[PDB]
């Protein structure tokens, strides 16, 4: 078990730093630059040097802060994002939780709490604006997050995340739910806090939002939890709305199908990050609550309608 949690947790941190590496490289390729290829063999050494350098960067204990809550926020954010990864289905999950997608939804609702704890306990007006817009991003994302995670999972009929693997062996899940996939994508941009719907760590809005007072290793923990949440909910959109091929004798073909589909989905996540202009929280609350909340409730109505329209109800 300990060898399994080492080979799950240490390669996901190395792959998260290498995701930051290929994020900056494909982001700079979008912005017509070659990217950080000098310091590594084709640049395979730069966010490892960032995670090294932010250790002996000086941390900050300000006058105005409360230091216990100020230091208990990023350690809970790292524990949060690295223990959100364990009810992921994969071929076979490490935690075979019976209703684990509600734990995913609950700890992603916990993911928009450590940012508010940080933005209060930093004791800056800038961090307080970032904390209030993190509350506004909760107000935006959370009910449409739960309704998209409810209504298309009513077609699977169970909150066990293992039962979605057997559902979509021959066909994908974006073919029965194409508006639900793109509305899940634009709500998971709000939970992930990436540059379409990033409104609480922005250099043009505030001075980087909620990371005003956070230097060094705690800022490395917040960046760690940030990019762990990026690859995490890329894997969530991968594991719900697209269906890879399952052979029960060969899970490795399923894992490399997961690899190519998750690499194109993380490529379109950082492509949709680096393309668009960045929102304002008035029209974020306006387009979600006025436009995309009754569309989620109406496709939720149509997902009430479908198992009595045909075929019976799904299995337990």
């Amino acid at each position: 078990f300990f060898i399994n949690i080492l080979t799950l947790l240490v390669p996901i941190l190395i792959a998260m730093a290498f995701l930051t590496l290929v994020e900056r490289k494909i982001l700079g390729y979008m912005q017509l630059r070659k990217g950080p290829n000098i310091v590594g063999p084709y640049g395979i050494l730069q966010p490892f040097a960032d995670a090294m350098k932010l250790f002996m960067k000086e941390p900050m204990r300000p006058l105005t802060t409360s230091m216990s809550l100020f230091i208990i926020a990023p350690t809970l954010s790292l524990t949060l994002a690295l223990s959100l990864w364990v009810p992921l289905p994969m071929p076979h999950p490490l935690i075979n939780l019976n209703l684990g997608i509600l734990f995913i939804l609950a700890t992603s609702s916990l993911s928009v709490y450590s940012i508010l704890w940080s933005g209060w306990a930093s004791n800056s007006k800038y961090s307080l604006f970032g904390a209030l817009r993190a509350v506004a991003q909760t107000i935006s994302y959370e009910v449409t997050m739960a309704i998209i995670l409810l209504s298309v999972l009513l077609m699977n009929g169970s909150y066990s995340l293992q039962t979605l693997i057997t559902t979509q062996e021959h066909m994908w899940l974006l073919l029965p739910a194409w508006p639900m996939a793109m509305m899940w994508f634009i709500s998971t941009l709000a939970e992930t806090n990436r540059a379409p719907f990033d409104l609480t760590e922005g250099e043009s809005e505030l001075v980087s939002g909620f990371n005003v007072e956070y230097a060094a290793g705690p800022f490395a923990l917040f960046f760690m939890a940030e990019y762990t949440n990026i690859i995490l909910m890329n894997a969530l959109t991968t594991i719900i709305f697209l269906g890879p091929l399952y052979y029960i004798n060969l899970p490795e073909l399923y894992s490399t199908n997961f690899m190519m589909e998750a690499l194109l989905l993380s490529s379109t996540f950082l492509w949709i990050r680096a393309s668009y202009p960045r929102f304002r929280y008035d029209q974020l609350m306006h387009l979600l609550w006025k436009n995309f909340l009754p569309l989620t409730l109406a496709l939720c109505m149509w997902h009430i309608s479908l198992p009595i329209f045909t075929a019976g109800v799904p299995p337990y």
Binding site: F129, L199, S204, E205, R280, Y281
Partner: protein
């Protein structure tokens, strides 16, 4: 020494792509200017930003300083 410049005042407002740019040179008859005001285009724009930013929020005001295109060397002089 430079140019011995005849005295008098001129001000030549040309189209800067921020707006009005024109310099109010006065000459003493020597080769030095006596004074000039350099017309910043955005000086009156950022004077009038208080009118146009009412009833909005902070992302709208950073959108309006990006719209109005204020760089500050000509304005602070």
């Amino acid at each position: 020494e430079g140019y011995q410049v005849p005295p008098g005042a001129t001000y030549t407002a040309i189209e800067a792509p921020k707006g009005e740019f024109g310099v109010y040179l006065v000459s003493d008859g020597s080769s030095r200017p006596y004074r000039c005001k350099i017309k910043a285009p955005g000086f009156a724009h950022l004077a009038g930003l208080d009118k146009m930013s009412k009833g909005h929020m902070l992302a709208d005001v950073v959108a309006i300083i990006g719209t109005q295109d204020i760089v500050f060397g000509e304005i602070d002089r």
